Design a protein around this nucleic acid. Structure first.
Ligand SMILES: [Zn+2]
Ligand SMILES: [Zn+2]
Ligand SMILES: [Zn+2]
Ligand SMILES: [Zn+2]
Lengths: 73, 72
DNA sequence: TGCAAATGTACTAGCT
DNA sequence: AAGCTAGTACATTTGC
């Protein structure tokens, strides 16, 4: 029914940077590329990213964005 | 020379029965008072150090309880 | 309390 | 019109 972001499963708003994603992942990805962050995972570089757990691990969120194909060109 | 028994930061005193940093003092008070329906994105054994304690409320609250924090 | 960083929404710019 | 996304400003969250 409702389009699903391929990063967090929140409702997708469009195809952003090459990948159907939600509003919060679009801006999260651009800020992650062009910004400095000490994103450090606390598990095994392998976390679950869903609508809640996405805030838990930005390191694994960024990782799953890239594995989904996001790119700024 | 005083380490937090939850995250290992500069403990600021004995809070809710446990030597703990300021940040863990406040986090446990918030967690214990309201819902703590937190969720872990890993395997319920996330590393909870000064850097990564922000990452997993669920594992942090679990560690608070393991260390003995309570409202005595 | 304050200050600030991170995150998320809603909106505008600009294209076709 | 219609439909799209990238950007941006604002608000909210979260944390010292
Ligand atoms: Zn998303
Ligand atoms: Zn992770
Ligand atoms: Zn602590
Ligand atoms: Zn965890």
């Amino acid at each position: 029914h409702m389009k699903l972001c391929l990063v967090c499963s929140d409702e997708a708003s469009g195809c952003h940077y090459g990948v159907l994603t939600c509003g919060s992942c679009k801006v999260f990805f651009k800020r992650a590329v062009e910004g400095q962050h000490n994103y450090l995972c606390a598990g095994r570089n392998d976390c679950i990213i869903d609508k809640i757990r996405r805030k838990n691990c930005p390191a694994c969120r960024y990782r799953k964005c890239l594995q989904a194909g996001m790119n700024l060109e």
